[PDB]
Amino acid sequence: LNPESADLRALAKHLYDSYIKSFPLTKAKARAILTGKTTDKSPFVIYDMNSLMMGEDKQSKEVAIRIFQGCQFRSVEAVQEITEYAKSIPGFVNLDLNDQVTLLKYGVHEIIYTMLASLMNKDGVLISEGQGFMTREFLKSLRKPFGDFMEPKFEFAVKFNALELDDSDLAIFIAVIILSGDRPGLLNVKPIEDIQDNLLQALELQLKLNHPESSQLFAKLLQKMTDLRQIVTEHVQLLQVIKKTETDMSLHPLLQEIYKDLY
């Protein structure tokens, strides 16, 4: 290790520590829960309407809506955690505040679906901080339009999880996503690109040191950033459909704010 590499290791560590502070349920813990390698009770499995209702004992709108709005509630909490994490990225809070807002607005869902993969396997997803496991099949079975809203997220996840990143890798990756200089409407791109340049260098070194056997992991990971955007744009279209067809529902105000003039 040389002095520039050292500064990059320090940045990696600083981000890892902020990540652990900001995000209560890590991929480490999630994996422990999913494999069974934990001394906690295994999670309650939700695979049908009945199991759901018995698990709720751990509103009274229809099931698909209750599930969809539980996802909204989780995002709202996730946005708060991501906002706190973003504030720890060196140089972030020194940006024009309008640009901080724009970066968060466009970054949060990409990060949400990234971190959701940490909680997923090919059969289902941990919920309620790992106290539950909701099956992929059950989510597929929901009545249209809700029946296939999770499928693109699971398909992304199985591919993304094959990279076998850990929390120390994810912490840098997430910061890279937030510091994207090509978000629409940014006022001053230069200081954002300067920060992202450093982060990307930090990520590349991190991946070389933590995964020395996995050649071109850095390049595979950068291509996923493009796939995350697709997940978000498609989701926006699904939301448009849902907003037209289900005037039962109401989007949480934080989410209205994020989604307004997003794509």
Binding site: T83, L97, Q100, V101, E257
Partner: peptide, 11 residues
Amino acid sequence: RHKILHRLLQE
């Protein structure tokens, strides 16, 4: 616009 995010950022 972005009243909440502003708030979370400045908090």
